């Protein structure tokens, strides 16, 4: 089998379309997602053209092996897609209508900077390598691009699934390549992070600040050091559900900053006890009284500063 | 091979049936389950019809490749089902009786709102895309729908396995699609959650309340802070066996509310010590005496309120 | 290819045999085990019969595709078995001797009630569906049923591998099915549970009881609360190695009961301190003195009661 | 295709050879390792013999399907090996030289008794089942047995890869089986266990013994209980990287014995406090003074005893 | 199919090229990485020569099965590569231009010594075994060696992807083997290690040193002991995170050294209390005063020494 011949010197336009059936397994650590969709391809092959009157039949159905099909591949997939051909239909003029159902694990980078208040643009890149006889260019048939109403991505809100209609045409290893960008716009469902990580984390911090209404060094040491260990447990829990980034994430910045608050609380608790032992509780009382205001005020201001920088 | 031709303008009715052999791996986090079943298909192909008298044989057995078989697919599967054809039998009138054994990982969403006292409706959606020549419509042969008596789903009680007999007929990419809903009704075995999470969690909370019968600030700080850490441990344990939901679960609500009880106990412990140091233990005693009643009463009432909202 | 014709109206007897080569991956959580074995099948096909004198050869070797082979399947397998045909031999009378080497992940339920002092009966169910022309019945050739001497199942003792010689003959979807039960009897190697879970757990419990020889409320609170947290660590460790059961397991009962001992010790520690503060240490001393005997005595008796109910 | 006929009544000698390319994934819990190697087979088939003068070529290359190849299998593999035929070469006398590249997950039991100062002998068992016409016996061609210089097994030192040249010839299901033992001798790289488990574990034990230079019961309770909890963390850590053995391992014995030291330290701490409260600190002092010497002396002696029994 | 015949006694030169499409899953524990690339092969087969005037085509396209293709394999891959042939083009002179898209899990050793400030040279080894008729030698076509601009390896910086143009020609099992070394130079993104492991770890070490400004033994015991439990909870981590090395990594040496600081602080805390109880706080004060300077000074110097030895 050979590719369709050009009437003039024009390339072959393969009209593409992806219709999402299932969206699942968005792995943040792996920066991958799994997809189950329909891939529709359409091109003109005049060699397959027929007179509908003389043939009786308006449409002709073919097996993949029987006709020439353009080698369309996905750029950002882990292993080559599992594909099952649904139908191949030839119209009288020779227009082929290919339809397959596929499943693929797509590699798409995520921006964790605003986590867990981040939004992502997942990509599915379609590509075709031009052949020796003629060049192949990709196109988007918007009527065959979409997603099923039941398509849900656990822990995410699906906003849109659109295609950048203009292909990226470039040269690779002395041959022309036509690439298409299918974009799935999603936003993270931050809800669960509030009662499970954010609020538990703040409670333990506020518990550490009760040491500013205590003169008992032994109890203060217990309060500040214990809550610090609960914070490490949370810090570890958070970094296990995320990949290692060469930048700070929003949660990462807050979590890190809270260590400084624990450290400074230890200094305060230490200073207050030292002064008390030195028989100067007057200075120790003023420092502790200031801390009561200073710690929540600086925490509240530092968080306004961080939220401003990240959002 | 081509589809059977219509006698009049009628579509082709493919009578379906799923008989469950094994049910396993209900993954809560993934919202998937694995199934091993029989898929039975039946349709009329008059081209395969034969006179039983002249043929001698009352039934004719065929290989899948030898005859036209409708392309029936599962909508909500991770990867395309692994299928092994058991038998294909043609009756004298041309009625084909197809039987295959399959295994599939089914994607079915879960309602975690009443966890671990939740019940679910798992779905298996069958679909067929109509061809060029004629439309294909799905049907349910109730005689061939069921499940084996030994079918067990670890940690779940299987109530029913029925089919919504009326197919969902719709249009997708200029063709007709006939969808069927097979529903597996299951209820969670909550038993283990009581001696492993619920009762241990309440014990540690009641241990924290013994600080209301203690004047020792250093001991109270130990009691309330230490038990709080065991609660953080149980909170993490519970959320590791669950996905992130944009809603509050029953266990989630209880676990969250218990943080407030720990926080308020820390305030009490702090208040009692402050007053005692300020040489006013009469106020400290009245607050501690009230707490002894207030904490269990408000906990018992708050739980009645929550159970009412959730059930 | 068609099945062998009956001389009279008799069904076809397929003599089976499973010879275990390797046993591995007994997953308690999953209630599965992996096997690697030989499957031997034998049936009479008179169409394949030959005169040994004129043929010279006493035996004739065939390729699977060349002759009719009964569709034998495993009921309780995750995915269809990986099978490699070793040999197919036809005797002069037409007796076929089939041999294949297979590997399968078998789903077999486990009874955790007596864990880790439990014994299991793993099952491998063989099945054959009767065909259009004639019925197929399964049989056991005890001479071809066994296991290799080196067959080891990590953390288990293999007692026996036998077959229930009488098949379960029943009707499913208007056809006869002949099922066979191959039983692998195994007992759990409890040894490791004693120095890793059982003894460490008792040590921490006995450490908590040293609070009955202490008047230091602050120290007692530390003793009882710290050891309680280690018990939570062990409970979690144990429940991670097991599936969630709708019944109490032996270890589960002991672990749960120990929480009650920790709770009552907290009550004692609280009571002793309250009385001491109320200036009545005479009552506090008598309660603490009684606890010294009561706690080990009630623990020893409660365990005798539990061991009696479980074994 | 049939096996080569015997000139006299002799069996067929298949000369084997395994040349390791890559060694990886030695899983201690699973008692498995992954291998990537060359399998070379050589036998005489006089039916394939040719005159080198008349033929023109001194060697003839064949496709697997074209000639008879002995069904050589691995005994101790999880799933049947992934094999890719590299070459099949026939010499003028009819000597066939088969070469394939394979990858397999090998099940080989491990002796954990001396962990992490243990050495293992990994096995790869080759087997051949004799056919109807003639018997097949395995042999070792030492010239084709080896391993690549770059072959590394992460966390292990590879000592040797040799073959037990004499095959284990036995009868199974009325047919002769010839088995070969390829042995990969390896020793564990214990280094990392010293700064990560052994030394951290000793430091915490020695920290617990500082309670013998303290009269503060409240501090001693903290010292001994805290370090006891950190010992439980190291115990749990160790047991996660190991399978459940029906015997005591070296690390297991030391870890277990250390619990006894923590228990006896709790008794001492308790005894010292009781006597001091009873207004007899003179005994309490003598018991504490003895403990300072007794604990390290008994620990040092007990360890000499254990190392002697284990090595 | 047979290999191309030599015009003179020359070997066959197969010009290779790897163009990386995707880089992912660099597993430090496993010392593996996953790759998705293009493999281009080119050789001369004069038997495939054709006249474009007669064939009516300037370049001929072939199916893999139709022509002789050299058996090129990857040395350091876990399982045989998933390959999909993109194109096979033969020009009139008989020069074949093969192109395939592949995905493989490559085994490449990592040098964790300077971790997490470590740089690595990942290798992809191409190999060809010479055949009976003629020798096959590998070559590098630099024009067809590269990587896509979007190629990202999570947590790593990709520096270069080059090929050692001179093949390693050697003899293995009486045949010539031609090996090629494709080198991917990468450097680890250490950023995340600083706010997640390094700084949290130093904070807890500095918190432990506040015991040098405290006379409260009970509080110092909590301080040094509790922070030690967290320097433990860290190191699991770095350990959870790495393979076991027969050498010391940079982070490993720092973590190990920190344990000595915690141990010596316990000695100090113990010494100070003993002297205080012995009614000699003047010695205790001088030791504690020195410790305040000695501990940070020795820590700062020890770290300069370590950083010097590692870098
Ligand atoms: C006036 C005291 C200020 C203390 C500031 C502490 C700075 C810590 C710098 C950390 C750098 C990252 C490092 C050890 C920190 C111990 C601090 C002990 C404070 C004792 C105060 C005594 C009462 C006068
Ligand atoms: C201290 C405790 C941590 C503070 C967390 C503050 C949340 C925040 O900063 O939330 C940020 C997000 C906004 O996200 P966005 O709309 O996608 O930004 C796009 C906007 N631009 C383009 C103009 C920059 O607000 C929300 O809607 C969630 C509010 C949740 C409140 C949680 C309180 C706990
Ligand atoms: C602290 C709070 C502990 C939780 C208490 C159980 C919650 C509950 O009462 O759960 C209730 C569920 C059953 O609910 P259902 O029949 O499925 O709902 C249908 C409700 N409609 C139709 C009215 C909407 O469990 C039970 O059978 C209760 C047994 C568990 C007792 C655990 C005691 C500890
Ligand atoms: C005479 C004291 C009896 C105490 C019985 C405690 C019953 C606990 C019931 C738990 C139900 C599950 C729930 C809070 C338990 C706090 C108990 C405090 C005891 C204080 C004693 C004061 C000394 C007179
Ligand atoms: C704290 C409680 C610790 C648990 C004590 C062991 C429970 C037990 O006694 O377990 C019993 C099982 C054996 O039972 P079986 O022979 O399989 O039962 C069959 C009984 N019929 C057929 C009559 C019904 O283990 C043993 O051999 C006991 C050795 C373990 C001792 C551990 C000491 C710590
Ligand atoms: C807690 C006590 C610390 C643990 C002591 C290590 C055990 C040991 O001494 O182990 C011994 C093994 C070597 O054993 P082998 O020579 O291979 O046995 C074969 C012997 N036969 C054939 C005679 C039976 O390690 C060593 O070379 C010791 C180095 C490790 C020192 C770690 C110090 C911490
Ligand atoms: C003068 C005090 C020197 C202390 C030397 C400690 C050596 C520790 C060696 C560890 C080897 C690894 C092993 C137990 C260590 C307990 C040390 C208790 C110190 C008590 C000081 C009393 C005040 C005079
Ligand atoms: C506790 C101690 C924490 C570790 C301190 C940093 C280690 C270091 O100095 O790391 C060094 C590496 C870079 O090394 P390189 O340039 O690739 O080596 C090549 C050098 N030759 C050729 C001379 C051998 O990182 C840096 O640029 C340092 C930035 C990290 C600072 C973290 C502060 C906390
Ligand atoms: C003191 C250190 C506590 C560490 C907490 C780790 C919990 C993380 C579990 C994450 C599972 C994915
Ligand atoms: C004193 C704090 C104990 C913390 C125990 C955390 C263990 C984490 C286990 C995570 C396994 C994936
Ligand atoms: C402060 C301690 C928090 C520790 C939480 C540990 C939970 C481990 C869950 C493992 C189950 C897979
Ligand atoms: C109160 C702290 C409980 C921590 C339990 C951790 C158990 C982790 C075991 C991991 C096994 C895979
Ligand atoms: C009381 C604290 C128990 C800590 C348990 C540590 C869990 C180890 C996880 C190992 C990762 C494979
Ligand atoms: C008491 C020390 C427990 C610390 C262990 C934390 C385990 C984290 C596991 C992370 C695994 C990916
Ligand atoms: O035929 C199919 O498998 C796709 C299912 C159609 C849809 O429900 O979106
Ligand atoms: O797999 C089969 O062929 C039938 C299984 C019958 C059953 O549920 O026991
Ligand atoms: O794998 C085989 O073909 C035979 C296994 C023989 C045995 O039990 O060792
Ligand atoms: O993969 C191959 O075909 C040869 C392996 C050669 C080697 O050990 O490097
Ligand atoms: O045709 C291909 O699949 C490779 C994609 C080219 C590239 O974008 O690097
Ligand atoms: Cl395609
Ligand atoms: Cl693809
Ligand atoms: Cl189908
Ligand atoms: Cl499907
Ligand atoms: Cl079969
Ligand atoms: Cl099966
Ligand atoms: Cl073979
Ligand atoms: Cl094998
Ligand atoms: Cl024999
Ligand atoms: Cl190749
Ligand atoms: Cl390869
Ligand atoms: Na084609
Ligand atoms: Na304390
Ligand atoms: Na057959
Ligand atoms: Na070829």
Author numbering:
A (entry chain C), B (entry chain D), C (entry chain E), D (entry chain A), E (entry chain B): 5 to 315
Show me the paper's own sentences about this structure.
GLIC is a bacterial homologue of the pentameric ligand-gated ion channels (pLGICs) that mediate the fast chemical neurotransmission of nerve signalling in eukaryotes. Because the activation and allosteric modulation features are conserved among prokaryotic and eukaryotic pLGICs, GLIC is commonly used as a model to study the allosteric transition and structural pharmacology of pLGICs. Unlike the other pLGICs, GLIC displays a particular activation mechanism in which protons, rather than a sizable agonist, trigger ion-channel opening. Here, experimental evidence for carboxylate binding to GLIC is provided by solving its X-ray structures with a series of monocarboxylate and dicarboxylate derivatives, and two carboxylate-binding sites are described: (i) the ‘intersubunit’ site that partially overlaps the canonical pLGIC orthosteric site and (ii) the ‘intrasubunit’ vestibular site, which is only occupied by a subset of the described derivatives.
In attempt to check whether other dicarboxylic acids with different lengths are also able to bind GLIC, we solved crystal structures of GLIC in complex with malonate (diC3) and glutarate (diC5) at 2.9 and 2.65 Å resolution, respectively. The first carboxylic groups of malonate and glutarate occupied the position of acetate, with a similar interaction pattern with Arg77, Glu181 and Arg105. Indeed, all of the monocarboxylic and dicarboxylic acids were found to bind in this pocket with a similar binding mode for the first carboxylic group involving Arg77 and Glu181 from one subunit and Arg105 from the neighbouring sububnit. For dicarboxylates, except for malonate, Asn152 from the complementary subunit contributes to the coordination of the second carboxylic group.
